[PDB]
Design a protein around this nucleic acid. Structure first.
Ligand SMILES: Nc1nc2c(ncn2[C@@H]2O[C@H](COP(=O)(O)CP(=O)(O)OP(=O)(O)O)[C@@H](O)[C@H]2O)c(=O)[nH]1
Ligand SMILES: [K+]
Ligand SMILES: [Mg+2]
Ligand SMILES: [Mg+2]
Ligand SMILES: [Mg+2]
Ligand SMILES: [Mg+2]
Length: 592
DNA sequence: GGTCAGGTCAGGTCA
């Protein structure tokens, strides 16, 4: 059946004027207060919990323990992440039914269900609605994190930039009631406004879009020869060049916006008809040449480049950019190294003047964002030996590369992991499936690759560092899952935890070992399987020590094989958790 | 049973 209740406000319901006859009269006073609360002054200092304790009479809850149990899930909603869920069970289970006065008159057998129902009501009709009334939730796009802005200042931000967009031709109204492709959302991006579109779901045309994008990636393969895998690029470049590596990374400003629809349409028509049929060709071009979008119940045309959020703008922008930089890429200096994922260029060469020339070559052809550009060039004001590109960190001097992590200060790492799956729901009495499914290798698979475990251009100690960081991530995921077990499963009778923990350390060590042996490097000495597993456990402890009273049984059990080969490993790094992970917030508390 | 090939689901990466 269904054992999950979703935390997102999306599923909320607009409160009725009166209680529905099914629910008890008590709720109405809450409802009344809610209306009063909505009418109440919209003071900018606002805490959802305080206002919420006023509108909801405590008498509904009866005892303070019952009330606190309910406001715990309210707090969870205030601190929610995308896709997060709780068990519906938690809304009735372990509630002191003797305290609830209105329930006391009713027969005990029906008390849970009724309670459940009523609790459900108050969340969908009051809690989620009032939160949505005072606050607006926007995805940070860093993990599953959700930032809560005051509704007023978000509407002012979105309308400010909406007028800043109507004034310029970027957004016009074509006003012929043409069907909206999707709804435009404006979601803050530091300085930039990052305007995107949530397309409306179309299942009938989705296979056609997939066919189209497949054909376009095939024209990118057949023509404009693939630039090559970044791993082998870096490998051959570091092996062939012995001198100091000078490199620059540049971020194209509004890569999708500044594409020219006329040029891209006439480029789409250029494709030979056997690789793309002319009827399909015409579809591609009139799709991208006519982009119609619904804003505040109004429809507008988008005439600035490729609309972001489309199901065919990515492959098209790649087609455009890759064709457009063919001249440089086709033949450069044999010494030189260049690579672009999408909108992000990375160029390294022994000769500094060449890197300088490349910066100015790209800067003239396109308009860049100058804060995002990173280089070790002496002429630049803040040269760095470590340059970040494609979710990795390349140190040009050391020639070492390490996984890049994006953890702002005060960031709560629990956001990074999706523990709840509404399509495949685990019952509350099956904690083992939840914890296991959380610890399946697929989530860290990206970091268990050649790039991070190769020793061809990576030092052995840097291989150790990458694996240690990956295991730290795994452990934070484990701890988050444990908290989820305690918050919603609430299964106190749990001893299966250690089996999953140990099995996962074993298996991840095996995977990293098998990928490390396959991509043996010249810098490779001897790499223990045993001390790799031991490093996994020390990485765990670095995280579990953050909640040592709650975990002390487990951590003391862990301490009782940690045997660490080669003198280059400092070994201080493995005992103390890295500085990046020390300040991430592992306790959730309502900040609104 | 042991491979494959297709398909599906899942969680992660990049921009
Ligand atoms: N549909 C989506 N497209 C995206 C997403 N992220 C990036 N992109 C596309 O990748 C391109 C690069 O995005 P970036 O985040 O690097 C910033 P953008 O290039 O839009 O401009 P600047 O902020 O001036 O750097 C962007 O133009 C678009 C996404 O989450 N969804
Ligand atoms: K960016
Ligand atoms: Mg970028
Ligand atoms: Mg960009
Ligand atoms: Mg991660
Ligand atoms: Mg997915």
């Amino acid at each position: 059946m269904v054992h999950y209740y979703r935390l997102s406000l999306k599923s909320r319901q607009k409160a009725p004027k009166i209680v529905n006859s099914k629910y008890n009269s008590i709720l109405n006073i809450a409802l009344k207060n809610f209306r009063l609360c909505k009418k109440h002054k919209t003071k900018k200092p606002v805490q959802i919990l305080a206002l919420l304790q006023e509108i909801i009479p405590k008498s509904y809850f009866g005892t303070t323990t019952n009330l606190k149990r309910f406001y715990k899930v309210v707090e969870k909603i205030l601190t929610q992440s995308s896709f997060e869920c709780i068990h519906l069970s938690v809304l009735h289970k372990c509630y002191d039914y003797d305290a609830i006065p209105w329930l006391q008159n009713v027969e005990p057998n029906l008390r849970p269900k009724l309670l459940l129902k009523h609790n459900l009501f108050l969340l969908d009709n009051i809690v989620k609605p009032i939160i949505a009334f005072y606050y607006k939730p926007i995805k940070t796009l860093n993990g599953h994190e959700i930032k809560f802005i005051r509704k007023e200042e978000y509407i002012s931000f979105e309308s400010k930039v909406f007028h800043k967009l109507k004034k310029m031709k970027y957004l016009v109204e074509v006003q012929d009631e043409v069907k909206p492709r999707g709804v435009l959302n404006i979601i803050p991006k530091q300085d930039n406004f990052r305007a995107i579109v949530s397309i409306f779901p179309d299942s009938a045309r989705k296979p056609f879009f997939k066919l189209l994008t497949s054909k376009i990636y095939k024209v990118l393969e057949e023509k404009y020869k693939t630039s090559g895998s970044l791993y082998t690029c870096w490998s051959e470049f570091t092996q062939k060049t012995q001198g100091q590596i000078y490199g620059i990374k540049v971020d194209i400003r509004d890569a999708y916006g500044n594409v020219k629809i006329p040029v891209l349409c006439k480029l789409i028509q250029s494709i030979p008809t056997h690789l793309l049929d002319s009827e399909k060709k015409n579809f591609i071009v009139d799709h991208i040449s006519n982009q119609f979008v619904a804003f505040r119940r109004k429809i507008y045309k988008w005439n600035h480049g490729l609309l972001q959020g489309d199901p065919l703008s990515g492959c098209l922008c790649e087609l455009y950019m890759a064709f457009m930089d063919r001249l440089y890429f086709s033949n450069l200096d044999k010494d030189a190294f260049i690579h672009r994922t999408v909108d992000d260029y990375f160029f390294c060469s022994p000769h500094p003047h060449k890197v300088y020339d490349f910066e100015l070559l790209i800067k003239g052809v396109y308009q860049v964002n100058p804060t995002k550009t990173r280089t070790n060039l002496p002429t630049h004001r803040h040269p760095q030996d470590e340059i970040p590109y494609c979710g990795k960190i390349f140190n040009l001097t050391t020639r070492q590369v390490r996984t890049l992590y994006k953890l702002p200060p005060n960031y709560e790492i629990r956001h990074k992991f999706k523990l709840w799956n509404f399509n495949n729901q685990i019952s509350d009495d099956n904690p083992a499936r939840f914890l296991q499914k959380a610890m399946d290798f697929p989530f860290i698979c990206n970091s268990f690759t050649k790039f991070e475990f190769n020793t061809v251009f990576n030092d052995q100690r840097t291989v150790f560092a990458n694996f240690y960081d990956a295991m730290i991530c795994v452990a934070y995921k484990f701890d988050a899952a444990m908290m989820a077990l305690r918050t919603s499963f609430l299964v106190n009778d749990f001893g299966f935890i250690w089996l999953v923990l140990s099995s996962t350390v074993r298996a991840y060590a095996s995977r990293a070992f098998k990928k490390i042996v396959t991509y043996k490097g010249g810098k490779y000495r001897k790499v223990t399987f045993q001390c790799l597993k031991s490093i996994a456990w020390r990485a765990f402890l670095a995280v579990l020590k953050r909640r040592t009273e709650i975990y002390k049984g487990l951590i003391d059990r862990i301490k009782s094989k940690l045997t660490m080969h080669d003198g280059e490993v400092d070994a201080s790094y493995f005992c103390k958790l890295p500085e990046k992970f020390r300040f991430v917030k592992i306790n959730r508390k309502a900040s609104i």
